[PDB]
Design a protein around this motif. Structure first.
Motif, PDB file in Angstrom:
ATOM      1  N   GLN A 302       0.825  -1.208   0.000  1.00  0.00           N
ATOM      2  CA  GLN A 302       0.000   0.000   0.000  1.00  0.00           C
ATOM      3  C   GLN A 302       0.861   1.259   0.000  1.00  0.00           C
ATOM      4  O   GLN A 302       1.779   1.393   0.814  1.00  0.00           O
ATOM      5  N   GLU A 303       0.537   2.206  -0.875  1.00  0.00           N
ATOM      6  CA  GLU A 303       1.379   3.381  -1.054  1.00  0.00           C
ATOM      7  C   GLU A 303       0.826   4.583  -0.296  1.00  0.00           C
ATOM      8  O   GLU A 303      -0.377   4.691  -0.045  1.00  0.00           O
ATOM      9  N   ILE A 304       1.733   5.486   0.096  1.00  0.00           N
ATOM     10  CA  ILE A 304       1.354   6.800   0.593  1.00  0.00           C
ATOM     11  C   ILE A 304       1.519   7.780  -0.558  1.00  0.00           C
ATOM     12  O   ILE A 304       2.373   7.597  -1.429  1.00  0.00           O
ATOM     13  N   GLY A 319      10.002   8.831   8.802  1.00  0.00           N
ATOM     14  CA  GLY A 319       9.452   7.692   9.514  1.00  0.00           C
ATOM     15  C   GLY A 319      10.462   7.233  10.540  1.00  0.00           C
ATOM     16  O   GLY A 319      11.578   7.749  10.608  1.00  0.00           O
ATOM     17  N   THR A 320      10.059   6.260  11.360  1.00  0.00           N
ATOM     18  CA  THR A 320      10.986   5.770  12.370  1.00  0.00           C
ATOM     19  C   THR A 320      10.788   4.275  12.541  1.00  0.00           C
ATOM     20  O   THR A 320       9.703   3.752  12.291  1.00  0.00           O
TER      21      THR A 320
ATOM     22  N   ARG B 307       6.194   3.813  -0.999  1.00  0.00           N
ATOM     23  CA  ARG B 307       5.705   2.964   0.090  1.00  0.00           C
ATOM     24  C   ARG B 307       6.205   3.502   1.431  1.00  0.00           C
ATOM     25  O   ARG B 307       7.348   3.966   1.518  1.00  0.00           O
ATOM     26  N   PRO B 308       5.399   3.461   2.499  1.00  0.00           N
ATOM     27  CA  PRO B 308       5.865   4.045   3.774  1.00  0.00           C
ATOM     28  C   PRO B 308       7.107   3.362   4.335  1.00  0.00           C
ATOM     29  O   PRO B 308       7.858   3.993   5.097  1.00  0.00           O
ATOM     30  N   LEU B 311      10.231   5.512   4.191  1.00  0.00           N
ATOM     31  CA  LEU B 311      10.426   6.495   5.252  1.00  0.00           C
ATOM     32  C   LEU B 311      10.695   5.838   6.609  1.00  0.00           C
ATOM     33  O   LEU B 311      11.526   6.324   7.394  1.00  0.00           O
ATOM     34  N   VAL B 312       9.992   4.747   6.908  1.00  0.00           N
ATOM     35  CA  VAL B 312      10.238   4.044   8.160  1.00  0.00           C
ATOM     36  C   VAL B 312      11.688   3.595   8.223  1.00  0.00           C
ATOM     37  O   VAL B 312      12.295   3.612   9.303  1.00  0.00           O
TER      38      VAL B 312
END
Ligand SMILES: [Cl-]
Ligand SMILES: [Zn+2]
Ligand SMILES: [Zn+2]
Ligand SMILES: [Zn+2]
Ligand SMILES: [Zn+2]
Lengths: 377, 377
Positions: A302-304, A319-320, B307-308, B311-312
Motif C-alpha cells: 500500500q502506497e502513501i 518515519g521511524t 511505500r511508507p 520512510l520508516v
C-alpha cells in the motif's frame, strides 16, 4: 547449570498458519549456538505488529512460527564466543540489532543495523541458517529475531540489551517495542523543540508514548486524534491539550487540524499504520517547516501519496523504526530513566494476564480494549 | 527627477493572451502607491516559469499581463512610507517577498512570507487591489509580483532586495530565481555535509546549481542523471563526478543509483518537476538517513507516491521554494558571495540579447539551446 547445553521443553504459543488463533503447547528449544543467547522470558506483551503478521499482512510472514517481540527476561545460557552477557543477566531482546561496527550502527542518525537482519527476516539464526524451535522434530520459525511468545527463546547476541538487574521485568518489557518507538519518534526522529505544537494520530500505546514524550520535550499544545473517543481521558492524563474525533467533523481531518492551528502543527505523528491517515498527518503539518513522522506499520504494498506542493512549501515526511534508538546501547538508558522515576511507563499496562490467556489478549487488542497486556508464565 | 510622481511611458513585452507571441510596445506605468517601489529594469532573464504561464498552463494565469521575474535594476522612485530603499539604489525584485513580521519570516527554517502573495498571485498590488500598467487606459496585470519584461515596473517594498552597487546587473539578475533555488536546496534545505554523496536529477540551470553547490559543500561524489546525454559535459564542468542516462539501463533508475552506491546517496535532488522522478530520487536516497529534496514544480494533477517502508527505514522527503532564502535578507548576501569570486554564476549565462528579440529568446528556451538568456534594453 541444569539446562545448559541441553534442549529445553517449555510452553509457547505457536502460529501454525495465518489468521488462526495461536496454540499454547509444548515446544523444544535447542541450546544456543556460537554468538547466540538463550533467554528465559519472564514477561511479554502484545504489539499490534504481532497481530499484523498473524492476520496474514506480513510479506515475509513465515509459518509455523512463534511471534512476540516485547519482552524482558534472564539469560539462561550463552553460546560459544559470547562475551557481552552471562547467565543471570537481565535482558531485553531487541528486534532491531546493534553491532556497533556496520555503517548504520556508526551513523548518529540510524539504528538500522545489518548484522543479522538477513536471517531474522527469514526466521532463522545466522550461525547455521536454521531455527532453534522444534515440534516433533519439525522446525518452528522465529519472528523479528526475538520470538518472545515462549518460556525460552534463542536470539543473536547483537539483539540482547543488558539492563539494570534491579528493574522490574513485568514493566520494562514494554521498552522492547511500542513505548520506546513512540518516545524516540519524539526525541530522536522529530527532535521536538520546547514550545512546539504536536498532533498525534492514534491513541494506543504508541500514540500515548508520543504524547508523553512531547510533553517532556516541552510542547505547548498536543492534539490527540482518534475515532474511538473512549481513548481521550487517558490521552489527557498523558498530556493532551485537545482531543479530536474525526467523525465529529464533515471536513477531512487534516483540514480540521489546520483550521484549529491556522497553518498546521509543528510536528505530527501517525501511530496507526493507515496510509490515508499518514497522508492526513503530513498535510496538517505546519506550512513552511512542519515535520510528519510515520510510526505505524502499513500493510505491505500500500502506497502513501500527497501533492509535491506540500513538500515544496516546507513540510517534511519521515518515519521511524523502534524510535531510532540504537538498541543495545540505548535500551539500557531507557531502563535507567524509568528507574529514576521520570516516566509514566507503569500507566501503559492495563491488564496483567497469564500466558495461557494469550489469545484473549489478542482479542482485547483487536477490540481496542487495552493499552498493553503483560503476560507471565 | 523628471519622472517621480508621474506616469511613465516605456517599452514592454505584453502577453495579450496565452500561446501567442509577446507584443513589444509602449506601456503606461503608474507611479508607486503606498509601500511600493518603481524600478528601472537594467537586465532581465527568461525562465521556464515565464514560458509555462505564457503557454496557458498556469491555473492562476491572468491575461493580459507582463511576465518576467528574473531581473536587476535601479530604483526610480518610491511610494508613501517606503524607507528601506531610495532612488538610485541597486535592487533585485524577488517573486518571494520578505516582510520580517509574519510567522514565516520569523521562523529560522522558512522563507514563505505571506505579506503580499494573495495580491501578487492575482497580478495586482496590495495597497488598492489594482495593477499599475495600462495600455490605452485598459489594465495590464502583473506577474509573480515582479513583471520585469518592462523598462519600468512597480513592485511591493517587501519584494525589493537592496544589493551592492558594485555588482554587474546583467549577472546578478539570475539570483532572484533558479540559480539561488538550486544553491539553497543544498545549503539551506538539505544542508549537505562534507564527504557526502549526492545525486541530481535534471540538468537545466537549477540542477547545475545544485551540482555547483554540492561540490562547494564538499560532496565526495555527485551523480548527474538526465535522459539527455548532451547535457553531461556541462554537468561535469559544474562538478559532477558521474553522469547517468536512465535510458541506458534496463532496471529502474533508483536501482541503478543504489547499486552504484551500495545503499543510495546521502542526498538526492529532483530538479525537473516530474513526480515519477521525484519518487525515484526518494528511493535512491541512502537507507537509514538519506534526504531527498524536491526542487522542481510538478504539473497540475500529479501526486507523489512511495511505500511508507521507504520512510520508516530512514529516508526523509522534503522540498524547497526559492532555495529557502529569505529574499530581502539573504539575496544581498548571495550578491556579496558572487562578488567574492566563490561562485560560477557567470557560467549560467549562455546568451545576451536585446529586449526587442524577446520572442526569439523564448524560442531558444523552448528549443533547449540555452541555460539562461539575459535581455537588456
Ligand atoms: Cl491591507
Ligand atoms: Zn512492535
Ligand atoms: Zn550494526
Ligand atoms: Zn525563473
Ligand atoms: Zn513575512
Amino acid at each position: 547449570s541444569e539446562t545448559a547445553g541441553k534442549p529445553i521443553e517449555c510452553k509457547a504459543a505457536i502460529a501454525w498458519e495465518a489468521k488462526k488463533p495461536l496454540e499454547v503447547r509444548t515446544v523444544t528449544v535447542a541450546p544456543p549456538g556460537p554468538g547466540e543467547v538463550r533467554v528465559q522470558i519472564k514477561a511479554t506483551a502484545l504489539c499490534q505488529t504481532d497481530a499484523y503478521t498473524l492476520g496474514g499482512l506480513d510479506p515475509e510472514g513465515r509459518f509455523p512460527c512463534i511471534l512476540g517481540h516485547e519482552a524482558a527476561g534472564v539469560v539462561e545460557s550463552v553460546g560459544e564466543g559470547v562475551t557481552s552477557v552471562k547467565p543471570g543477566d537481565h535482558v531485553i531482546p531487541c528486534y532491531q540489532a546493534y553491532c556497533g561496527e556496520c555503517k548504520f550502527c556508526k551513523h548518529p542518525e540510524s539504528n538500522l543495523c545489518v548484522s543479522v537482519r538477513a536471517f531474522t527476516g527469514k526466521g532463522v539464526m545466522k550461525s547455521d541458517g536454521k531455527p532453534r524451535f522444534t515440534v516433533d522434530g519439525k522446525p518452528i520459525y522465529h519472528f523479528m529475531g526475538t520470538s518472545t511468545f515462549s518460556e525460552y527463546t534463542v536470539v543473536h547476541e547483537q539483539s540482547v540489551a543488558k539492563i539494570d538487574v534491579n528493574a522490574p521485568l513485568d514493566k520494562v518489557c514494554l521498552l522492547g517495542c511500542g513505548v520506546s518507538t513512540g518516545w524516540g519518534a519524539v526525541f530522536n526522529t522529530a527532535k521536538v523543540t520546547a514550545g512546539s505544537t504536536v498532533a498525534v494520530f492514534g491513541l494506543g500505546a504508541v500514540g500515548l508514548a508520543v504524547i508523553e514524550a512531547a510533553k517532556r520535550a516541552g510542547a505547548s499544545r498536543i492534539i490527540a486524534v482518534d475515532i474511538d473517543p473512549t481513548k481521550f481521558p487517558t490521552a489527557k492524563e498523558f498530556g493532551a491539550t485537545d482531543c479530536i474525533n474525526p467523525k465529529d467533523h464533515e471536513k477531512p481531518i487534516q483540514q480540521v487540524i489546520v483550521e484549529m492551528t491556522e497553518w498546521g502543527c509543528d510536528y505530527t505523528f501517525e501511530c496507526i499504520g493507515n496510509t490515508a491517515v499518514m497522508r492526513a498527518a503530513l498535510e496538517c503539518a505546519h506550512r513552511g517547516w512542519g515535520t510528519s513522522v510515520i510510526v505505524g506499520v502499513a500493510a505491505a504494498g500500500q502506497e502513501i501519496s500527497t501533492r509535491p506542493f506540500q513538500l515544496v512549501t516546507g513540510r517534511r515526511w519521515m518515519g521511524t523504526a523502534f524510535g531510532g534508538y540504537k538498541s543495545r546501547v540505548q535500551v539500557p538508558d531507557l531502563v535507567t530513566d524509568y528507574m529514576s522515576g521520570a516516566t509514566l511507563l507503569d500507566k501503559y499496562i492495563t491488564h496483567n494476564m497469564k500466558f495461557d490467556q494469550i489469545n484473549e489478549a489478542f482479542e482485547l487488542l483487536h477490540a481496542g480494549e487495552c493499552l498493553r497486556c503483560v503476560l507471565t508464565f
